[PDB]
Design a protein around this motif. Sequence first.
Motif, mmCIF file in Angstrom:
data_model
loop_
_atom_site.group_PDB
_atom_site.id
_atom_site.type_symbol
_atom_site.label_atom_id
_atom_site.label_comp_id
_atom_site.label_asym_id
_atom_site.label_seq_id
_atom_site.Cartn_x
_atom_site.Cartn_y
_atom_site.Cartn_z
ATOM 1 N N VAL B 36 12.402 -4.668 0.665
ATOM 2 C CA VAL B 36 13.118 -3.485 0.221
ATOM 3 C C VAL B 36 13.636 -3.694 -1.190
ATOM 4 N N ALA B 37 13.357 -2.729 -2.058
ATOM 5 C CA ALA B 37 13.747 -2.765 -3.462
ATOM 6 C C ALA B 37 14.733 -1.631 -3.698
ATOM 7 N N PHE B 38 16.016 -1.912 -3.503
ATOM 8 C CA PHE B 38 17.039 -0.915 -3.775
ATOM 9 C C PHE B 38 16.954 -0.471 -5.224
ATOM 10 N N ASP B 39 17.102 0.832 -5.453
ATOM 11 C CA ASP B 39 17.091 1.384 -6.805
ATOM 12 C C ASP B 39 15.795 1.008 -7.524
ATOM 13 N N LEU B 40 14.711 1.578 -7.011
ATOM 14 C CA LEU B 40 13.360 1.298 -7.475
ATOM 15 C C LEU B 40 13.229 1.230 -8.992
ATOM 16 N N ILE B 41 13.964 2.074 -9.712
ATOM 17 C CA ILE B 41 13.886 2.050 -11.169
ATOM 18 C C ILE B 41 14.617 0.835 -11.725
ATOM 19 N N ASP B 42 15.739 0.468 -11.111
ATOM 20 C CA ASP B 42 16.456 -0.752 -11.453
ATOM 21 C C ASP B 42 15.720 -1.990 -10.976
ATOM 22 N N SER B 43 15.175 -1.943 -9.765
ATOM 23 C CA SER B 43 14.714 -3.159 -9.114
ATOM 24 C C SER B 43 13.472 -3.724 -9.787
ATOM 25 N N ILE B 44 12.467 -2.892 -10.029
ATOM 26 C CA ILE B 44 11.180 -3.360 -10.522
ATOM 27 C C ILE B 44 10.756 -2.529 -11.719
ATOM 28 N N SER B 45 10.307 -3.206 -12.765
ATOM 29 C CA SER B 45 9.595 -2.601 -13.873
ATOM 30 C C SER B 45 8.332 -3.415 -14.073
ATOM 31 N N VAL B 46 7.303 -2.819 -14.659
ATOM 32 C CA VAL B 46 6.039 -3.527 -14.798
ATOM 33 C C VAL B 46 5.441 -3.226 -16.162
ATOM 34 N N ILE B 47 5.222 -4.265 -16.958
ATOM 35 C CA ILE B 47 4.371 -4.161 -18.134
ATOM 36 C C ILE B 47 2.949 -4.372 -17.638
ATOM 37 N N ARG B 48 2.200 -3.282 -17.535
ATOM 38 C CA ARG B 48 1.021 -3.279 -16.686
ATOM 39 C C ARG B 48 -0.193 -3.922 -17.328
ATOM 40 N N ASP B 49 -0.332 -3.857 -18.644
ATOM 41 C CA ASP B 49 -1.582 -4.239 -19.289
ATOM 42 C C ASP B 49 -1.334 -5.356 -20.290
ATOM 43 N N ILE B 50 -1.338 -6.581 -19.813
ATOM 44 C CA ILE B 50 -1.303 -7.750 -20.675
ATOM 45 C C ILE B 50 -2.728 -8.234 -20.841
ATOM 46 N N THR B 51 -3.007 -8.900 -21.954
ATOM 47 C CA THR B 51 -4.386 -9.283 -22.209
ATOM 48 C C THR B 51 -4.796 -10.558 -21.493
#
Lengths: 52, 52
Positions: B36-51
């Motif tokens: 469970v990730a409370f406060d989805l915007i707070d809990s997880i962020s993703v820099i999706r495209d690294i080389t």
Amino acid sequence: QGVVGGRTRTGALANDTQGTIKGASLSVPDYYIKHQFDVGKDEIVNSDATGK
Amino acid sequence: TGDTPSESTLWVRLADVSDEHPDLLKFELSVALQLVAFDLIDSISVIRDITQ
């Protein structure tokens, strides 16, 4: 006689036949071994009276 | 890689899920788990495209 099966240590627990007790049954026969005689009551007193 | 395993608070059910069989021992090691990730915007962020 019951039959002993075989299996590996980890082999499947199969089942095998069993020793069969069968009910044996005779009977005291309904037929006698009689021997019977019609001793005349005259040949009783007579033979007692004159019996060597 | 070179640390002590440092057992957690997460519990793993070591169920001796044995059997009918008298020769096997048949263990299970099972855990249920949620993230469970409370406060989805707070809990997880993703820099999706690294080389790499």
